[PDB]
Design an enzyme around this catalytic site. Structure first.
Site, PDB file in Angstrom:
ATOM      1  N   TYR A   1       5.983  49.615  92.331  1.00  0.00           N
ATOM      2  CA  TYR A   1       5.714  48.212  92.820  1.00  0.00           C
ATOM      3  C   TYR A   1       5.291  48.487  94.035  1.00  0.00           C
ATOM      4  O   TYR A   1       5.957  48.236  95.245  1.00  0.00           O
ATOM      5  CB  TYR A   1       6.920  47.457  92.683  1.00  0.00           C
TER       6      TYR A   1
ATOM      7  N   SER B   1       3.455  39.510  81.478  1.00  0.00           N
ATOM      8  CA  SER B   1       2.362  38.367  81.912  1.00  0.00           C
ATOM      9  C   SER B   1       1.136  39.242  82.121  1.00  0.00           C
ATOM     10  O   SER B   1       1.094  40.483  82.534  1.00  0.00           O
ATOM     11  CB  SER B   1       2.816  37.604  82.906  1.00  0.00           C
TER      12      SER B   1
ATOM     13  N   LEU C   1       8.725  40.501  82.510  1.00  0.00           N
ATOM     14  CA  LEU C   1       8.290  39.691  81.502  1.00  0.00           C
ATOM     15  C   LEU C   1       6.685  40.489  81.542  1.00  0.00           C
ATOM     16  O   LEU C   1       5.908  40.527  82.507  1.00  0.00           O
ATOM     17  CB  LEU C   1       8.011  38.378  81.819  1.00  0.00           C
TER      18      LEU C   1
ATOM     19  N   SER D   1       4.450  29.982  91.837  1.00  0.00           N
ATOM     20  CA  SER D   1       4.606  30.872  91.126  1.00  0.00           C
ATOM     21  C   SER D   1       3.446  31.896  90.960  1.00  0.00           C
ATOM     22  O   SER D   1       2.826  31.730  89.872  1.00  0.00           O
ATOM     23  CB  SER D   1       5.069  30.433  89.711  1.00  0.00           C
ATOM     24  N   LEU D   2       3.355  32.560  92.026  1.00  0.00           N
ATOM     25  CA  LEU D   2       2.161  33.185  92.116  1.00  0.00           C
ATOM     26  C   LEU D   2       2.352  34.529  93.138  1.00  0.00           C
ATOM     27  O   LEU D   2       3.011  34.409  93.989  1.00  0.00           O
ATOM     28  CB  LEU D   2       0.913  32.476  92.557  1.00  0.00           C
TER      29      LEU D   2
ATOM     30  N   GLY E   1       0.077  28.515  90.284  1.00  0.00           N
ATOM     31  CA  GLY E   1      -0.125  29.782  90.052  1.00  0.00           C
ATOM     32  C   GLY E   1       0.281  30.025  88.488  1.00  0.00           C
ATOM     33  O   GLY E   1       1.448  30.076  87.867  1.00  0.00           O
TER      34      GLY E   1
ATOM     35  N   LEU F   1       9.487  32.545  92.925  1.00  0.00           N
ATOM     36  CA  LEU F   1       9.941  33.569  92.003  1.00  0.00           C
ATOM     37  C   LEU F   1       9.889  35.001  92.925  1.00  0.00           C
ATOM     38  O   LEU F   1       8.761  35.263  93.597  1.00  0.00           O
ATOM     39  CB  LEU F   1       9.010  33.702  90.804  1.00  0.00           C
TER      40      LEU F   1
ATOM     41  N   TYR G   1      11.294  39.391  92.934  1.00  0.00           N
ATOM     42  CA  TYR G   1      11.469  40.619  92.225  1.00  0.00           C
ATOM     43  C   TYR G   1      12.526  41.437  92.992  1.00  0.00           C
ATOM     44  O   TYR G   1      12.269  41.497  94.403  1.00  0.00           O
ATOM     45  CB  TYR G   1      10.348  41.308  91.824  1.00  0.00           C
TER      46      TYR G   1
ATOM     47  N   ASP H   1      -6.000  27.768  95.507  1.00  0.00           N
ATOM     48  CA  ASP H   1      -6.272  29.073  95.947  1.00  0.00           C
ATOM     49  C   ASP H   1      -5.451  29.108  96.952  1.00  0.00           C
ATOM     50  O   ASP H   1      -5.659  28.643  97.927  1.00  0.00           O
ATOM     51  CB  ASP H   1      -7.758  29.631  96.376  1.00  0.00           C
TER      52      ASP H   1
HETATM   53  N1  LIG Z   1       6.461  39.230  85.010  1.00  0.00           N
HETATM   54  C1  LIG Z   1       7.316  39.663  85.693  1.00  0.00           C
HETATM   55  O1  LIG Z   1       8.063  40.642  85.339  1.00  0.00           O
HETATM   56  C2  LIG Z   1       7.791  39.081  87.089  1.00  0.00           C
HETATM   57  C3  LIG Z   1       9.159  39.521  87.722  1.00  0.00           C
HETATM   58  C4  LIG Z   1       9.636  39.025  88.771  1.00  0.00           C
HETATM   59  C5  LIG Z   1       8.895  38.046  89.453  1.00  0.00           C
HETATM   60  N2  LIG Z   1       7.819  37.739  88.977  1.00  0.00           N
HETATM   61  C6  LIG Z   1       6.993  36.714  89.634  1.00  0.00           C
HETATM   62  O2  LIG Z   1       6.508  35.531  89.084  1.00  0.00           O
HETATM   63  C7  LIG Z   1       5.319  35.056  89.455  1.00  0.00           C
HETATM   64  C8  LIG Z   1       4.356  34.469  88.586  1.00  0.00           C
HETATM   65  O3  LIG Z   1       3.781  35.760  88.192  1.00  0.00           O
HETATM   66  P1  LIG Z   1       3.683  36.179  86.567  1.00  0.00           P
HETATM   67  O4  LIG Z   1       4.289  37.564  86.411  1.00  0.00           O
HETATM   68  O5  LIG Z   1       4.296  34.863  85.529  1.00  0.00           O
HETATM   69  O6  LIG Z   1       2.180  36.382  86.233  1.00  0.00           O
HETATM   70  P2  LIG Z   1       0.873  35.305  86.081  1.00  0.00           P
HETATM   71  O7  LIG Z   1      -0.184  36.097  85.944  1.00  0.00           O
HETATM   72  O8  LIG Z   1       1.359  34.281  85.084  1.00  0.00           O
HETATM   73  O9  LIG Z   1       0.858  34.325  87.414  1.00  0.00           O
HETATM   74  C9  LIG Z   1       0.483  34.856  88.845  1.00  0.00           C
HETATM   75  C10 LIG Z   1      -0.573  33.841  89.219  1.00  0.00           C
HETATM   76  O10 LIG Z   1      -1.072  33.817  90.623  1.00  0.00           O
HETATM   77  C11 LIG Z   1      -2.120  33.508  90.538  1.00  0.00           C
HETATM   78  N3  LIG Z   1      -2.856  33.675  91.743  1.00  0.00           N
HETATM   79  C12 LIG Z   1      -3.350  34.852  92.334  1.00  0.00           C
HETATM   80  N4  LIG Z   1      -3.890  35.122  93.309  1.00  0.00           N
HETATM   81  C13 LIG Z   1      -3.734  33.621  93.744  1.00  0.00           C
HETATM   82  C14 LIG Z   1      -4.240  33.071  94.739  1.00  0.00           C
HETATM   83  N5  LIG Z   1      -4.762  33.667  96.024  1.00  0.00           N
HETATM   84  N6  LIG Z   1      -4.246  31.509  94.844  1.00  0.00           N
HETATM   85  C15 LIG Z   1      -3.723  30.984  93.794  1.00  0.00           C
HETATM   86  N7  LIG Z   1      -3.300  31.582  92.845  1.00  0.00           N
HETATM   87  C16 LIG Z   1      -3.283  32.889  92.430  1.00  0.00           C
HETATM   88  C17 LIG Z   1      -2.882  34.172  89.078  1.00  0.00           C
HETATM   89  O11 LIG Z   1      -4.276  33.448  88.690  1.00  0.00           O
HETATM   90  C18 LIG Z   1      -1.880  34.089  88.182  1.00  0.00           C
HETATM   91  O12 LIG Z   1      -2.099  32.927  87.285  1.00  0.00           O
HETATM   92  C19 LIG Z   1       4.880  35.807  90.625  1.00  0.00           C
HETATM   93  O13 LIG Z   1       5.277  35.765  91.979  1.00  0.00           O
HETATM   94  C20 LIG Z   1       5.507  37.080  90.253  1.00  0.00           C
HETATM   95  O14 LIG Z   1       5.619  38.070  91.512  1.00  0.00           O
HETATM   96  C21 LIG Z   1       7.250  38.045  87.977  1.00  0.00           C
HETATM   97  C1  LIG Z   2       6.388  45.081  88.315  1.00  0.00           C
HETATM   98  C2  LIG Z   2       7.640  44.575  87.678  1.00  0.00           C
HETATM   99  C3  LIG Z   2       8.512  45.801  87.276  1.00  0.00           C
HETATM  100  C4  LIG Z   2       9.719  45.215  86.531  1.00  0.00           C
HETATM  101  C5  LIG Z   2       9.894  43.901  86.457  1.00  0.00           C
HETATM  102  C6  LIG Z   2       9.050  43.154  86.946  1.00  0.00           C
HETATM  103  C7  LIG Z   2       7.897  43.438  87.364  1.00  0.00           C
HETATM  104  C8  LIG Z   2       6.901  42.445  87.722  1.00  0.00           C
HETATM  105  C9  LIG Z   2       5.846  42.143  87.027  1.00  0.00           C
HETATM  106  C10 LIG Z   2       4.835  41.359  87.588  1.00  0.00           C
HETATM  107  C11 LIG Z   2       5.065  40.870  88.819  1.00  0.00           C
HETATM  108  O1  LIG Z   2       4.082  39.774  89.191  1.00  0.00           O
HETATM  109  C12 LIG Z   2       3.051  40.276  89.812  1.00  0.00           C
HETATM  110  C13 LIG Z   2       2.970  41.850  90.279  1.00  0.00           C
HETATM  111  C14 LIG Z   2       2.003  42.224  90.997  1.00  0.00           C
HETATM  112  C15 LIG Z   2       0.965  41.300  91.521  1.00  0.00           C
HETATM  113 CL1  LIG Z   2      -0.469  42.162  92.298  1.00  0.00          CL
HETATM  114  C16 LIG Z   2       0.778  40.211  91.265  1.00  0.00           C
HETATM  115  C17 LIG Z   2       1.967  39.497  90.180  1.00  0.00           C
HETATM  116 CL2  LIG Z   2       1.947  37.648  89.817  1.00  0.00          CL
HETATM  117  C18 LIG Z   2       5.909  41.029  89.740  1.00  0.00           C
HETATM  118  O2  LIG Z   2       6.191  40.579  90.856  1.00  0.00           O
HETATM  119  C19 LIG Z   2       7.017  41.769  89.290  1.00  0.00           C
END
Ligand SMILES: NC(=O)c1ccc[n+]([C@@H]2O[C@H](COP(=O)([O-])OP(=O)(O)OC[C@H]3O[C@@H](n4cnc5c(N)ncnc54)[C@H](O)[C@@H]3O)[C@@H](O)[C@H]2O)c1
Ligand SMILES: Cc1ccccc1-c1ccc(Oc2ccc(Cl)cc2Cl)c(O)c1
Ligand SMILES: NC(=O)c1ccc[n+]([C@@H]2O[C@H](COP(=O)([O-])OP(=O)(O)OC[C@H]3O[C@@H](n4cnc5c(N)ncnc54)[C@H](O)[C@@H]3O)[C@@H](O)[C@H]2O)c1
Ligand SMILES: Cc1ccccc1-c1ccc(Oc2ccc(Cl)cc2Cl)c(O)c1
Lengths: 229, 60, 60, 229
Positions: A181, A221, A219, A119-120, A8, A169, A171, A72
């Site tokens: 969300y 992303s 974050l 991490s996806l 991911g 990972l 949330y 995938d």
């Molecule tokens: N960004 C935030 O604030 C936050 C907060 C809490 C948790 N998370 C979690 O962190 C993890 C990584 O996400 P991120 O926020 O770094 O964004 P990101 O876009 O860096 O990573 C998510 C990745 O999932 C991949 N992906 C989506 N569908 C897929 C599939 N069917 N098969 C394989 N790969 C696939 C996407 O290509 C993407 O690269 C996620 O689980 C997200 O829920 C993010």
């Molecule tokens: C929505 C949000 C609010 C506050 C903090 C983090 C986040 C947050 C950001 C990206 C996140 O990553 C995703 C959120 C939705 C989807 Cl469809 C895919 C991903 Cl990788 C997440 O799970 C939570």
């Protein structure tokens, strides 16, 4: 000699990248699993040196990227692969990108690993709220963001050394309502956090392998920006 | 400015810890969780969020 | 044979992780929490107990 | 140049010691606050090399112990010392053992520190179950096991650099019932896990200092045995 598969990553603005950078501080070999639709974009960007600055570990090492593979998490084995994505412009020129196919590829090429990162996440209807989410949409959230972790575990356990370790990972929306969300992502994380326990008992008892999940705060992303409220 | 910008702004205003949350902050935790240093932890949800998750009510 | 011996026995039988739980297993987690590697974690109760706390029912 | 004060070592069979071993591995400087009831005997044993096998960090590393101080967490300032314990056989000889005093002492010999460990508990009536605990015993358990943390914090917070980190130890009986963990010990750990959040708010906002608690599994320490069941 430790190997970590990070599943991911589509760029360097997400958590997968930060995890890669910190593992490198400990000399661990990193293999990326990339969602096919953005795999060629990623390779190009990488080849064209867009990630060079982002690869430098303060301490004058380059990130040691063992390999980068299409991956995938929608597809467990070769025969889950549906016809429309078999003919999809992005997929049909790539092969061996189902969860089992990449377990095997990695094992064939580099032996057993000892570190796994989920991490996806994905949910087609994240822009809708839970009440307005369809079955199809909900279930895609769960499949792609929650079942994907179980499946990873089942296929990779076999190519991992005992005492090896696994994270994903999550949330806080799973435990406390964050409006926006949507699409069943909250449900997906709830399931993920509960599956982490149940997986921990099985993997722990049978393989002496550990599993935990990190509940990160926000974050900016790619996927985060794709939420949109 | 969308949803993530709200969440980042709220987090940075209200989390116990004031600093900007970096992906490497999460990375150093995953590093540790993936290592033998944490051999006795499993099945856990570990919060790496500058503590935001512990708050009930804001101050503003 | 005391409370603590029941406790150890039960944990070594029923915990997800079968190893004996060692002072130094907590020690290394303590070490990580005290270090900068955990700069984004605060206010938490982190369980270091071979996962016993996640179990509801025994099996045997 | 990290320095850690570890409050609650009486021997090498507890979590305090294991915390000291692992902290050495990182070359952090260790200062022990020992309870006066066992202080002279701990010193004596150390001097006679009783702890020599125990101080062995496999890696041909010897434990490095900056200092050893008498310390009683029931006492905030010197004015909190009652005449009786002030005159007691064990305390009469020692001084600067209150929470305030050991803070100053440490701040004079060594400057600000950046790691603090609370690894202590006590409860006069642990042997009695909650229903049968007296007010006195209950309050003793909270005083000794929960307040001591808060107070350790008030005073040490001023001899710690920003970015420093503090930890305490807890036990799951706070969240789920373990019969035999009585005396209001369970209450005290519930309070300590609550105060860990509140303090993290105050310490984070004002000092940029972090605090967490570790909920450990069972270990056969001296205190563990004193629970006659
Ligand atoms: N960004 C935030 O604030 C936050 C907060 C809490 C948790 N998370 C979690 O962190 C993890 C990584 O996400 P991120 O926020 O770094 O964004 P990101 O876009 O860096 O990573 C998510 C990745 O999932 C991949 N992906 C989506 N569908 C897929 C599939 N069917 N098969 C394989 N790969 C696939 C996407 O290509 C993407 O690269 C996620 O689980 C997200 O829920 C993010
Ligand atoms: C929505 C949000 C609010 C506050 C903090 C983090 C986040 C947050 C950001 C990206 C996140 O990553 C995703 C959120 C939705 C989807 Cl469809 C895919 C991903 Cl990788 C997440 O799970 C939570
Ligand atoms: N041993 C276990 O199974 C276990 C499990 C979970 C949590 N804990 C917690 O870990 C911590 C350490 O306990 P342990 O098991 O290492 O036992 P221990 O007896 O090895 O440690 C307790 C130490 O605290 C000291 N102490 C007691 N009262 C004091 C006071 N008023 N002032 C200063 N020092 C004092 C004692 O001298 C003793 O050295 C405790 O908080 C305990 O509740 C222990
Ligand atoms: C009661 C128990 C059951 C299972 C595992 C550990 C423990 C356990 C052992 C010692 C513990 O420490 C103490 C318990 C009671 C008291 Cl009076 C002092 C201390 Cl230092 C603890 O908090 C929990």
């Amino acid at each position: 000699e430790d190997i970590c598969f990070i599943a991911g990553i589509g760029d360097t603005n997400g958590y997968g990248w930060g995890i890669a950078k910190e593992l490198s501080k400990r000399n661990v070999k990193i293999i990326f699993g990339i969602w096919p639709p953005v795999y060629n974009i990623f390779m190009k960007n990488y080849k064209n040196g867009k990630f060079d600055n982002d690869m430098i570990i303060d301490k004058d090492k380059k990130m040691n990227i063992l390999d980068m593979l299409p991956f995938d998490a929608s597809f467990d084995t070769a025969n889950d692969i549906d016809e429309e994505t078999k003919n999809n412009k992005r997929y049909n020129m790539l092969q061996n990108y189902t969860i089992e196919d990449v377990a095997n590829l990695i094992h064939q090429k580099y032996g057993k690993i000892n570190m796994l990162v989920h991490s996806l996440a994905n949910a087609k209807e994240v822009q809708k709220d839970l009440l307005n989410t369809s079955r199809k949409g909900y279930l895609d959230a769960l499949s792609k963001s929650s079942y994907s972790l179980i499946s990873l575990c089942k296929y990779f356990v076999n190519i991992m050394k005992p005492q090896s370790s696994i994270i994903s990972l999550t949330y806080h929306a799973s435990q406390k309502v964050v409006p926006g969300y949507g699409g069943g992502m909250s449900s997906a994380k709830a399931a993920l956090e509960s599956d982490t326990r149940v997986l921990a008992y099985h993997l722990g008892r049978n393989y002496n392998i550990r599993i935990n999940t990190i509940s990160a705060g926000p974050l900016k992303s790619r996927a985060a920006t794709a939420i949109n409220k | 400015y969308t949803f993530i910008d709200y969440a980042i702004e709220y987090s940075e205003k209200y989390a116990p810890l004031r600093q900007k949350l970096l992906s490497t902050d999460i990375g150093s935790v995953a590093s540790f969780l993936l290592s033998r240093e944490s051999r006795a932890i499993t099945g856990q949800t570990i919060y790496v969020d500058n503590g935001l998750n512990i708050m009930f009510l804001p101050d503003d």
